[PDB]
């Protein structure tokens, strides 16, 4: 029959395959590299990557999630890890280094299990189970503290905590006070969630690092419509509008028909009445300054500044929605349905200008209490001003967790030497076959203090072995490595808090990925 | 010669090695998918041109996104995709016969044998097959209430097996059977949604009997108005709000100043008017297919009542269908029959997203699942698995017989057939052996993918099942058999009784095939 070759597949020619246990080691391979990649940039003590964009652009950071996003690569590997990264962020907001290294280090154990031939079915069970008892153990010896606007100790420590690996950690005190002080402001306690539309971050080069500030109110890049207008307001009445101050126009196709001088004099009056009866409608109700979404005539603008009331000019929507949320005013849409009850009050507006540029902002301040704030964040470098920025989501976000959910544990690694000792001691009761299983899980979950003593600079197996033995000697979970150096291994002493939600989605997620990742036999491609 | 009869390029094979080459050519497609099947079934990974991967362990999928090309090695195709389209499960067991049939008859036809006597026996063998299947299924006829729901869960269960949320199969099936048995009576699949969050746990994913969709295009003030009611009306529109030209084909023509005012201050008049007519009506939810404008959305902020536009068709449908009112196109006849009623309604923040919750209605018949995962091709395959469920599940309430699973049935109808060709001559008794030979391929893949010694596994199983151990199958965990009856590996009856005809349907076409000539381009 000769069978002679035979088409089966479109393009057999040109596209690859890899199956058994070739693609499984390519797979651990990818993984590796890009954890090993990823190790350095962890703990206190790290470094920062620099990214050069497709269009040139350079990017300083030390975020995880960051870098994973700005490479590319062409493993399907290295993209779900990307992904891994970014779903950590999106769910919890920090560590999202961590579960990289984490996921690594656990495909990276699995290796030797797969060559001594066992089925990575039973390699992903006893990932399973160890899991879940490590997750079993990690809430029993977790703290609860506080959520309240009195104290605010905790939370200040816990932002310190997250920004103490940042280039911001020369005032890392004072924007951690920042940070909690406008997610406290800006919080619904009742319903236990806050929206992050109403904390609005900001950036302008130039003065410097510690001039970052918060604003109970709002700042925009406006200024006042006419040159000669009053540059301040201290008790400022404040009326929103979407209108342009135009004479009216209907939507639908219109025409107007003049036929007599009669009618062009009736049309010309009724112009200019227009704009005057704007104005004194606006006038009448007691404002003292108005904000509006489109653009001003020369008529208008000139009634403005005679009739001595300040306008501002082209804001956007959200901009008028913060302003409407924090000065208790509401947006009206015609001169018509303007009454004093729909006024806003604000203690202060001023206009401020920087330096030998002809830039200038407007600032809204001193209102009652407010549901919008604002973050003016300073540098000298832009990629300050964005890294400052990546350090502030951060704690926000870590504060949100801490509002979500109220218990803590202790970083320095103490809680994953707390897991690994408790999963090798569960480990010893299961006989079938899969204590290995349970033994590369203890080990894989000790790779976090390796790489931030090796990051330190001290020796890792010393260090950690000496750690263990004091913990399983004495009794305090709170045991980790003294990575600033301040002469004590007392994580609770040295406040250092993480928290709980934190390492269960780090753990859980991880687990599950290496569980997708070993489950996969065979791989094809075009070449 | 000089004027040929056909165009240049065509191509002609006839005879048996082209019959040979189709038979090794199906040999290869069954190879595709061998290793996805059993408990410990790996999965595969296919890109495509534009660089998209997927990650699959359905073989219906995986044949799809291969790209062949064979005249022959479609059919494989086709049977996989009538099957999942008819039972929705078994869609690697009806290649792997088809295959197995033609391998094990490829000899006879090696031997000059007409291919219509083949033909006639696996005719004769499918319906003895299928005729001894109805006979030994099994059913309870006035079973329970709650007897009618373990026969359900333990199927989904054993549908869940094989895939990658088989871990959580307990957790599963419960939601599963719970989104079947609140679904009408025509079953409809549209009545169930399936949304994806990014973020969190397998175990975070839930279940909402009430209906739940991702926040849509706000402009500003929507900030201002409060997101949680406890009793609130829900009116359901197909109606835009906002202030724009009545018609295209309008035109206004007018004279005088006044006039003009009176233009202008219409349009404001008739939007308004709209606007009290919907808030007299005592709604505070207002859901619309079409934008809703800033006007629009400041006045209902002003007076404390919650507005979305833009809402898909079939969400809204499912709102509808959740809640008890209907679409309105025009709202001058507002009443309260055609409101609908929730027991409360809130807006969530999920895994970096914001989502709408219509939660309490008792008499709804709709339900929406919540998935969460770590990536993209995870959640994906979590909903695949999840159709295979559903589907099985649907089945199963249709009609309730089952039979055990992991190679009982394949192991007690090769029996039959092996007993029932002793009885013919000639070479119908040939024909009908190989037939019944070919049956058994099921439990040795199980054993080869499990890693065991599949010959010995099989002389045990025949050695019981012949002794006279209806339901004994594999055990995986226990390297040995098992009853699969008594250890719940259930399954119903459509599924090996289409599988069997699809695969026989197949085999029969392909060796029905003489020549095969292709025109070109
Ligand atoms: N002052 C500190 N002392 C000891 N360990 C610390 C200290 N600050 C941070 N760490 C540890 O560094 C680890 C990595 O955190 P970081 O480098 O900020 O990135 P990520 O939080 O994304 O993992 C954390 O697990 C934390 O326990
Ligand atoms: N717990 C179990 N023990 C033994 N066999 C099982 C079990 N669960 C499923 N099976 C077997 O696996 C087969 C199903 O294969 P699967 O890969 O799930 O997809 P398909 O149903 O399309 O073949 C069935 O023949 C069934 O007998
Ligand atoms: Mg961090
Ligand atoms: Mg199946």
Redesign the interface.
Known sequence: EYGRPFLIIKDQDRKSRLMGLEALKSHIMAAKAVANTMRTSLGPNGLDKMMVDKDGDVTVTNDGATILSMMDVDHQIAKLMVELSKSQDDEIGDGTTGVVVLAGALLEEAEQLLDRGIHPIRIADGYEQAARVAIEHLDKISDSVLVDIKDTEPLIQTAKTTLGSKVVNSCHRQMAEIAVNAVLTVADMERRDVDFELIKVEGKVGGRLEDTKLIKGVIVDKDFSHPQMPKKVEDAKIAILTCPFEPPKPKTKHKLDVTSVEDYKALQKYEKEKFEEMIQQIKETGANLAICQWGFDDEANHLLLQNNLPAVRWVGGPEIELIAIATGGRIVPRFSELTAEKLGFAGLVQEISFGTTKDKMLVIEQCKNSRAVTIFIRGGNKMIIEEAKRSLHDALCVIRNLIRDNRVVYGGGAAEISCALAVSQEADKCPTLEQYAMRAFADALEVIPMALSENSGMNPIQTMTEVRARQVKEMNPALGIDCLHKGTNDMKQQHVIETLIGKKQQISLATQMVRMILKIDDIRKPG | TPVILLKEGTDSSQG??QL??NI??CQ??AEAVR?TLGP?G??????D?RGK?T?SNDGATILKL?????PA?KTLVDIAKSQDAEVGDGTTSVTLLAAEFLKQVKPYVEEGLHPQIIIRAFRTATQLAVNKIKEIAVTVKKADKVEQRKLLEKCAMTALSSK?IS?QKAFFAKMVVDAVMMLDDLLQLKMIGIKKV??????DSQLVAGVAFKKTFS??????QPK?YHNPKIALLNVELE?????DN????????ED??A??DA??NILYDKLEKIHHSGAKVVLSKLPIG??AT?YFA?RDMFCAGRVPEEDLKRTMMACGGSIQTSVNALSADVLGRCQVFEE??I??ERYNFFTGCPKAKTCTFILR??????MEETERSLHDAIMIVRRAIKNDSVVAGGGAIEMELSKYLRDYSRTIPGKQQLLIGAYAKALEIIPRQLCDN??FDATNILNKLRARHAQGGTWYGVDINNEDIADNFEAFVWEPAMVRINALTAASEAACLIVSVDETIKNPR
């Open positions: 048996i090695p040979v080459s090794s050519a290869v497609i290793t410990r790996m999965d595969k990974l296919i890109v041109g991967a990650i291969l790209d062949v090309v064979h090695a990658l871990q990014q973020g969190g746990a397998l175990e402009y500003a003030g929507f900030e201002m949680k202030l724009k030209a009545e018609k309008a035109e206004i023509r007018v004279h005088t100043v003009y005012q233009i202008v349009e404001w800033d006007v400041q002003d969530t923040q895994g970096g995962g770590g990536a993209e091709q995870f499990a890693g």
